[PDB]
């Protein structure tokens, strides 16, 4: 499982049977000129790895160090306050800072709400899951929801990767991920790697061997101007999947820290610039 | 797109590469003896039709006439009360009838919740969709969600087909539905057809040509006792797709009646008996 070949296959598939939206306005516009930027979309795309290798490109450098720090901000710490991420030295989310520096009732908030019952105990979403995975590995009800229909209005923004369903089958743990939308150029490579690590963290606290990693995209897209540098990317030579060292000593999920994560031998291609749009 | 051609494939696969769950217990047990009745699953299975034909079985009789009535009760009526579904001539849900007669804060109740805002107004999941469809076909947030995390503990039961994502591209309404887990034998045929009817309904009241139809399932299971008759279903002869008639006079989504539908020429195979397990 290279992730490059798969990543490539979809990009190349959009450039050939893609669908634009020139015949539509609204939203996006560049920062370079500040006016309309359209896409090329496709529906229902699936990426499934078997955890042979580790989901990461070699044709470009991925901010893996930061991915994990973001992942932890949401899942482990369960925070809606960016001031907490600032302490981790990450300023990517600074743009959505609200009056109180939060993103409202989103992400870390939705993963922290104590709305479920577990033996006469108000528990949050993640906590619940953890327990069910060990005490009831047969359930077809292992799912996490970030798209709370009752709180879409009180959110600074709607999440892309809003859900996941876990599947315990034969001492194995399988994870399926669905994002309503996903910028193939920027966010996807990030998000793929980002969640795999999560699968790995859970599988260590519950002791189930690594299963299948299924990642699905709803509105798979590419910003028009991005195409040219993407074409270059699909011409760059690939590399071997770097071994990814995680601290073996950890027994509890809430005892993890960034220093407990390492990527051994991350050889990659030079660099490529992609204009940001909003 | 016979739906048979694909269905049989999913079945033929669950037989040869299908994971068992004997090792596990809890839940599912027959009635014939009332004890341990487990499955054989496969993960991340997806089906898709170009809508050339209508998705429906020919090797067995699907009680289509009742699929719609159920659908209707939830989307058009948006009710959690079974008595309403009773008056329609259905008693297939009387089992979960709670103390009050409503299956709780599940299904229809969710769709009905006035949680979203639009033009200084409080709207439910359903209406909002209908608005943004014509008032914003480009959006990447067209999502219906029954799986509300805040109310899982308040539902008489959890939905199999819980979410939908509509995509609008080039005057074509596109529908993708997600099923957490499904029983290929009894329940699958029912749910697939049921939602292709839902598409056509919405596709008309807005005014968009019929798009692609995607349907995927997480826990794609089959019961061990059923294997027997299924090995015969696949041997049965297949028929031609019956033309579904919808009243053209309808323009509003709430102006439908069961009589507004009629399945022209539905030739099919004989009968297969599948025992119920809960």
Curated annotation (Swiss-Prot), chains A, B:
Gene3D superfamilies: Thymidylate synthase/dCMP hydroxymethylase domain. One of its GO terms (cellular component) is cytosol. One of its GO terms (molecular function) is thymidylate synthase activity. Its EC number is 2.1.1.45. The lineage of its organism: Bacteria, Bacillati, Bacillota, Bacilli, Bacillales. Homodimer. (6R)-5,10-methylene-5,6,7,8-tetrahydrofolate binds at residues 183, 277. Changing residue 87 to K: In strain: ATCC 6633. It comes from Bacillus subtilis (strain 168). This is Thymidylate synthase 1. It is an enzyme of class 2 (transferase). Changing residue 117 to N: In strain: ATCC 6633. It comes from the Bacteria. Signal peptide: none annotated. Catalyzes the reductive methylation of 2'-deoxyuridine-5'-monophosphate (dUMP) to 2'-deoxythymidine-5'-monophosphate (dTMP) while utilizing 5,10-methylenetetrahydrofolate (mTHF) as the methyl donor and reductant in the reaction, yielding dihydrofolate (DHF) as a by-product. This enzymatic reaction provides an intracellular de novo source of dTMP, an essential precursor for DNA biosynthesis. Pfam families: Thymidylat_synt. Pathway: Pyrimidine metabolism; dTTP biosynthesis. The gene is thyA1. Thermostable. Active at 46 degrees Celsius. DUMP binds at residues 140-141, 180-183, 191, 221-223. Keywords: Cytoplasm, Methyltransferase, Nucleotide biosynthesis, Transferase. It catalyses: dUMP + (6R)-5,10-methylene-5,6,7,8-tetrahydrofolate = 7,8-dihydrofolate + dTMP. It is found in: Cytoplasm. The active site is at 160 (nucleophile). GO terms for biological process: dTMP biosynthetic process; dTTP biosynthetic process; methylation. B.subtilis strain 168 possesses two thymidylate synthases, a major form ThyA and a minor form ThyB. Belongs to the thymidylate synthase family. Bacterial-type ThyA subfamily.
């Amino acid at each position: 499982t290279q992730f490059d070949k798969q990543y490539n296959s979809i990009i190349k598939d959009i450039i050939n049977n893609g669908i634009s939206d020139e015949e539509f306005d609204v939203r996006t516009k560049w920062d370079s000129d500040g006016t309309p930027a359209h896409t090329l979309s496709v529906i229902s795309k699936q990426m499934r790895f078997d955890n042979s290798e580790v989901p990461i490109l070699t044709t470009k450098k991925v901010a893996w160090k930061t991915a994990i720090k973001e992942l932890l901000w949401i899942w482990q710490l369960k925070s809606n306050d960016v001031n907490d991420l600032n302490m981790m030295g990450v300023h990517i989310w600074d743009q959505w800072k609200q009056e109180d520096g939060t993103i409202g009732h989103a992400y870390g908030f939705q993963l922290g709400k104590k709305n479920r019952s577990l033996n006469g105990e108000k528990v949050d979403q993640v906590d619940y899951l953890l327990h069910q995975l060990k005490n009831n590995p047969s359930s077809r009800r292992h799912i996490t929801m970030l798209w709370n229909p009752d709180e879409l209005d009180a959110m600074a923004l709607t999440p892309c990767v809003y859900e996941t369903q876990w599947y315990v089958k034969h001492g194995k743990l399988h994870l399926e991920v669905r994002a309503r939308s996903n910028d193939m150029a920027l966010g996807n490579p990030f998000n793929v790697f980002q969640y795999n690590v999560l699968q790995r963290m859970i599988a260590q606290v519950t002791g189930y061997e690594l299963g299948e990693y299924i990642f699905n995209i709803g509105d798979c897209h590419v910003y028009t101007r991005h195409i040219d540098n993407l074409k270059i990317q699909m011409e760059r030579e690939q590399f071997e999947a770097p071994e990814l060292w995680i601290n073996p000593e950890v027994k509890d999920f809430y005892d993890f820290t960034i220093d407990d994560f390492k990527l051994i031998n991350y050889k990659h291609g030079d660099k490529l610039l992609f204009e940001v749009a909003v």
